[PDB]
Amino acid sequence: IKLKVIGQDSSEIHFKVLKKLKESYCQRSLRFLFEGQRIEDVIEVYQEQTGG
Amino acid sequence: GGISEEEAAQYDRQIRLWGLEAQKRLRASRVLLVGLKGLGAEIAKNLILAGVKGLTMLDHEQVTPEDPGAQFLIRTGSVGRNRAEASLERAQNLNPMVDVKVDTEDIEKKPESFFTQFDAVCLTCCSRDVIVKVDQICHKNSIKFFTGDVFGYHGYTFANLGEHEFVEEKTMVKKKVVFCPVKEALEVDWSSEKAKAALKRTTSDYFLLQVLLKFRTDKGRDPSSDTYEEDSELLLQIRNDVLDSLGISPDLLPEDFVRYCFSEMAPVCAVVGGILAQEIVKALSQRDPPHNNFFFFDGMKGNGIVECLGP
Amino acid sequence: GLPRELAEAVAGGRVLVVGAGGIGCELLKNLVLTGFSHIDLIDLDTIDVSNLNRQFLFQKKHVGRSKAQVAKESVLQFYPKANIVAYHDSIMNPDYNVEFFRQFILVMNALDNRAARNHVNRMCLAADVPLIESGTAGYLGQVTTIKKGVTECYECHPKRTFPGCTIRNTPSEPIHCIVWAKYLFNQLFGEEDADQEVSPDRADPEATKEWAKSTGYDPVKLFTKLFKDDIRYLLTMDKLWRKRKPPVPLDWAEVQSQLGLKDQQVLDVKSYARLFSKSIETLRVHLAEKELIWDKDDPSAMDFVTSAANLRMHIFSMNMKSRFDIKSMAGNIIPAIATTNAVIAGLIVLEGLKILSGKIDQCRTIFLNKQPNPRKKLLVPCALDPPNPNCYVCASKPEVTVRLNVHKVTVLTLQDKIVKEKFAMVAPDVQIEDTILISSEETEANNHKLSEFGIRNGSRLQADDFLQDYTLLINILHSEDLGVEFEVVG
Numbered sequence: 001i002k003l004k005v006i007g008q009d010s011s012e013i014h015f016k017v018l019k020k021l022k023e024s025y026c027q028r029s030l031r032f033l034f035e036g037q038r039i040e041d042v043i044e045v046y047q048e049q050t051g052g
Numbered sequence: 053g054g055i056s057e058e059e060a061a062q063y064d065r066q067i068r069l070w071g072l073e074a075q076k077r078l079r080a081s082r083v084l085l086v087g088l089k090g091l092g093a094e095i096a097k098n099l100i101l102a103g104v105k106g107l108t109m110l111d112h113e114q115v116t117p118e119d120p121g122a123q124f125l126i127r128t129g130s131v132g133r134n135r136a137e138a139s140l141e142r143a144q145n146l147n148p149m150v151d152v153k154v155d156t157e158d159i160e161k162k163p164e165s166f167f168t169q170f171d172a173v174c175l176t177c178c179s180r181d182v183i184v185k186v187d188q189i190c191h192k193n194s195i196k197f198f199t200g201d202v203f204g205y206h207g208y209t210f211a212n213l214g215e216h217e218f219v220e221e222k223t224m225v226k227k228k229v230v231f232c233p234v235k236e237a238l239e240v241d242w243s244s245e246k247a248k249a250a251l252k253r254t255t256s257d258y259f260l261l262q263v264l265l266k267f268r269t270d271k272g273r274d275p276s277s278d279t280y281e282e283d284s285e286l287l288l289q290i291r292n293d294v295l296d297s298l299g300i301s302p303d304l305l306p307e308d309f310v311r312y313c314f315s316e317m318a319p320v321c322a323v324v325g326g327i328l329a330q331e332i333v334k335a336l337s338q339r340d341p342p343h344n345n346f347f348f349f350d351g352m353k354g355n356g357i358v359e360c361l362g363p
Numbered sequence: 364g365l366p367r368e369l370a371e372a373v374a375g376g377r378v379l380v381v382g383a384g385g386i387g388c389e390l391l392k393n394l395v396l397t398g399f400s401h402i403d404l405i406d407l408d409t410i411d412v413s414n415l416n417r418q419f420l421f422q423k424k425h426v427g428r429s430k431a432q433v434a435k436e437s438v439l440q441f442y443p444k445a446n447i448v449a450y451h452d453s454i455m456n457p458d459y460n461v462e463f464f465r466q467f468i469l470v471m472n473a474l475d476n477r478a479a480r481n482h483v484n485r486m487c488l489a490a491d492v493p494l495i496e497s498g499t500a501g502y503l504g505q506v507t508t509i510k511k512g513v514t515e516c517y518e519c520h521p522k523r524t525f526p527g528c529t530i531r532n533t534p535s536e537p538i539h540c541i542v543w544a545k546y547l548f549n550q551l552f553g554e555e556d557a558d559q560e561v562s563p564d565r566a567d568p569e570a571t572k573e574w575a576k577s578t579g580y581d582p583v584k585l586f587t588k589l590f591k592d593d594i595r596y597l598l599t600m601d602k603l604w605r606k607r608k609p610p611v612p613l614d615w616a617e618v619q620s621q622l623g624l625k626d627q628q629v630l631d632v633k634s635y636a637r638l639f640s641k642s643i644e645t646l647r648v649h650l651a652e653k654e655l656i657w658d659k660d661d662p663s664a665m666d667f668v669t670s671a672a673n674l675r676m677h678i679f680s681m682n683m684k685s686r687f688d689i690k691s692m693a694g695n696i697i698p699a700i701a702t703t704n705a706v707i708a709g710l711i712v713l714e715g716l717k718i719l720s721g722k723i724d725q726c727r728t729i730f731l732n733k734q735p736n737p738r739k740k741l742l743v744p745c746a747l748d749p750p751n752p753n754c755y756v757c758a759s760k761p762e763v764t765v766r767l768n769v770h771k772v773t774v775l776t777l778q779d780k781i782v783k784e785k786f787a788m789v790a791p792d793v794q795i796e797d798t799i800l801i802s803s804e805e806t807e808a809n810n811h812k813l814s815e816f817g818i819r820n821g822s823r824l825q826a827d828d829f830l831q832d833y834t835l836l837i838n839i840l841h842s843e844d845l846g847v848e849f850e851v852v853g
């Protein structure tokens with residue numbers, strides 16, 4: 001697997017191997033999605049906002 | 053800098069998002085909005101808060117008894133007033149820095165020269181023929197064209213910004229995006245083996261839109277809940293004829309769709325008006341990639357989908 | 364307009380909106396236009412000019428008045444028949460209790476911080492009332508549904524600060540100088556706190572209100588002690604400056620002898636030193652009429668922090684920053700616009716209609732993106748997750764474990780920095796399981812350690828908040844190996 005995590009800011013980041021994937025990202029508080037469901041392919045990352 | 057200290061105080065929280073230069077571009081822009089029903093009201097409010105130079109609100113119709121009893125820009129009991137005039141005082145008061153004007157003439161009757169005074173043109177509640185006509189006009193004069201509508205739980209936005217250049221923070225990178233005529237957008241050939249493949253991944257809202265534009269064409273009005281049974285049957289017939297005519301199964305759009313596409317729902321106006329107004333703001337200030345070219349919202353499922361359709 | 368049952372529900376029951384700001388104003392409009400005929404609206408703030416770019420029920424003439432009050436009056440101008448009750452007040456206030464919450468068929472948050480969100484979460488669990496939660500920031504936002512016994516609660520999932528050393532002795536970023544300036548403002552005018560010390564730290568591993576009162580708060584004296592004296596005593600501690608660039612002390616007299624918006628320009632050293640003068644004079648005067656609390660919008664306080672931090676930046680060879688920039692950072696300002704809030708408020712009502720229609724199964728968490736995801740989705744709906752059974756809030760008989768030094772941690776530190784801050788209780792009653800430690804009203808003479816109470820590695824405390832109808836059992840672990848004053852044991 002040569003995977004990509006895309007963030008809301010369109011931040012494209014390549015990865016290859018709850019897990020460790022997240023652990024690299026969490027260092028750069030988030031939630032991880034694969035084509036719909038929670039966790040050459042794409043992982044979408046979503047952050048919860050606290051403004052209102 | 054190029055703005056007053058009162059404006060800077062007022063606009064502070066959006067200057068910190070999109071920059072003073074973006075704001076200055078807003079401050080120089082004038083927008084035509086046609087149709088002051090639920091969605092127009094939302095777009096109007098958002099553009100005026102943002103602080104365009106001018107907004108002209110064009111509606112030739114009156115407030116009717118069928119229209120909602122609460123409308124945030126119109127006082128209660130204005131049945132029979134022109135809908136633009138009925139919106140002016142509340143709209144203007146949202147932001148005195150904006151030159152908010154009203155026009156009461158039918159958009160169809162407007163000469164091509166009426167348009168040239170605007171940086172962007174946004175059409176709600178307009179017929180297919182008018183959408184194509186004004187989009188052609190805007191292309192000639194390089195005016196940002198937009199249209200949108202809401203119907204029950206659904207709505208859509210469309211943009212034609214021609215060849216559109218903008219900055220986007222990767223520092224700012226300059227980029228270019230190319231849009232197509234609305235006529236092409238609304239008249240896709242589903243024959244191509246390519247298109248057959250695109251169809252499997254195209255939201256059915258696009259076909260919903262074709263059905264409702266045809267209803268609007270045939271009836272001079274949109275479906276109304278007062279006439280639910282009458283309008284339901286006709287919508288079902290229009291679904292058959294529209295999809296049969298495009299070589300698609302009628303069943304792509306399910307037969308109960310009629311339950312979900314009547315009337316203006318205030319929350320659906322808020323959603324579609326927020327997306328549409330923000331695309332207008334992006335276009336005028338030349339910051340961030342705009343959606344190319346349709347946004348389809350389904351308030352039942354909570355989906356908002358950008359489709360590129362036409363080429 | 365709506366299915367009869369839904370319409371009846373909407374016309375029938377009463378709903379609660381918490382917050383009348385960006386999301387709240389939009390949401391109030393949407394609820395009324397949608398037919399909600401009984402709305403209570405609570406917000407504790409008054410209207411500020413910077414609100415006016417997105418809080419559309421408020422005009423300039425309303426500056427200084429209550430948000431909730433003006434919100435209601437603005438709505439009644441386009442729909443006189445609305446029934447709205449407006450509270451100028453905090454949801455955190457004990458009057459808003461479980462029976463108050465029980466009135467509502469739907470609660471909707473329109474808040475801008477976690478603590479109030481936590482409190483409301485607990486209230487809605489206690490009252491068994493569905494809660495729609497949401498937030499926004501910039502171009503982004505989301506909405507979700509919370510229902511007791513069906514979904515995660517707000518705190519089911521895990522949701523920073525800098526060491527005294529980096530702030531007192533070893534700053535490397537403008538933010539250290541900014542935090543320092545903030546500490547310096549509290550220490551001078553606000554609430555003295557040990558955690559907010561400004562004088563160089565004499566006990567560093569890499570190696571105040573009294574003093575200012577006795578000078579009658581003299582600009583030139585403070586300046587000299589802070590920008591000259593203190594950088595000298597820091598230059599004593601020679602180990603630090605073997606690796607990193609030394610700080611250069613500032614002489615008051617030497618200093619005096621040396622486009623975007625107004626606020627976006629970085630001034631010279633002399634100007635911030637003068638602005639340090641001016642603001643200190645203004646603050647000393649208005650400290651006599653009205654302990655002061657820091658607010659980003661108080662001109663003089665903002666000026667104070669701006670100048671202090673920029674002087675400290677200069678001293679440590681960093682480029683100085685515009686007041687505009689220091690405002691973001693010291694204020695923690697969230698950029699905010701009309702459209703994002705309008706889209707989120709629109710979604711909130713849609714979720715709400717699904718709930719009261721008995722179609723919660725169809726409710727979703729919905730993220731608003733800036734740009735379509737790969738499946739082309741600009742709004743991304745997701746399944747609601749079930750309760751986490753190990754949630755310290757919504758699970759049956761919750762418990763957690765805290766590791767702290769039992770001998771060197773106050774009863775004040777527990778009431779404050781732990782049960783209140785970390786665990787977001789408001790009206791907590793704590794009792795050692797075996798001896799009432801903290802009380803609702805009373806036990807004001809306990810603040811002065813825990814050790815001297817029977818508390819040791821393995822003692823148990825029962826924390827209540829009878830307002831939140833919440834009971835948390837806290838298991839204690841002793842240790843003296845902590846960095847840091849405590850850790851939530853994970």
Ligand SMILES: *NS(=O)(=O)OC[C@H]1C[C@@H](Nc2ncncc2C(=O)c2cc([C@@H]3OCCc4ccccc43)cs2)C[C@@H]1O
Pocket residue numbers: 051052381382383384385386405406407408430452453454455456473474475476478479
């Ligand atoms: N996103 S926004 O800024 O545009 O709008 C958000 C609105 C939320 C509103 N805050 C609010 N409203 C009702 N209750 C509580 C709150 C709070 O945010 C908090 C209150 C407290 C706490 O309560 C006791 C008294 C008190 C006094 C001073 C400071 C805090 C408190 C903590 S959090 C503000 C805005 O319009």
Ligand SMILES: [Zn+2]
Pocket residue numbers: 515516517518519520750751754755756757758
């Ligand atoms: Zn929980």
